[PDB]
Swiss-Prot record, chain B:
It comes from the Viruses. This is Gp30. It comes from Haloferax tailed virus 1 (HFTV1).
Length: 50, 114
């Protein structure tokens, strides 16, 4: 069913768009930052960000 | 990723006050807890001969081999040495006073694993 396929593509394509807008905002406009400086990335970076 | 702070291994020192005109500081690796020593510094209150000895006995100095490393003159510091001795190699370092009187001697460095 090509109309169902294309309905699925149109849906997924828009959802991807939502996700782009979301992620771009989320990354660009966070007021806080944890500079890992190539080290202690992982749990310590997550905990430091919290 | 794991990050460790490195502190240098145990300090070692031998010293004598008023060592007489032909007497000596016998630096013995038995006094170190890791059993071997690396002397970096020799502070001498007058002229001295430095001698490296191997013992024929495991725990007392009975001279098998003896080499005079250097002669230092005047009062001052020799530093940045790696004069090396250990108990299991039966190695002793001797500093002999050659001044016309009594002097003070302070040797310092660090321990090495036997
Ligand atoms: Mg802040
Ligand atoms: Mg020995």
């Amino acid at each position: 069913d090509l109309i169902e396929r294309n309905i699925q593509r149109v849906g997924a394509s828009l959802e991807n768009g939502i996700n782009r807008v979301f992620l771009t905002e989320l990354v660009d406009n966070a007021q806080n930052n944890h500079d890992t400086a190539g080290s202690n990335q992982g749990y310590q970076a997550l905990n430091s960000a919290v | 990723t794991d990050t460790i702070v490195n502190v240098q291994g145990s300090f070692f020192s031998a010293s004598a006050s008023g060592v007489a005109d032909t007497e000596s500081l016998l630096i013995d690796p038995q006094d170190a807890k890791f059993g071997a020593i690396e002397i970096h510094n020799i502070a001498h209150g007058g002229s001295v001969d430095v001698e490296l000895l191997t013992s024929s006995d495991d725990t007392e100095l009975v001279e098998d081999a003896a080499v005079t490393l250097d002669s230092f003159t005047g009062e001052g510091i020799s530093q940045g040495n790696q004069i090396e001795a250990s108990d299991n190699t039966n190695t002793y370092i001797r500093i002999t006073n050659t001044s016309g009187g009594a002097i003070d001697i302070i040797a310092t460095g660090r321990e090495v694993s036997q």
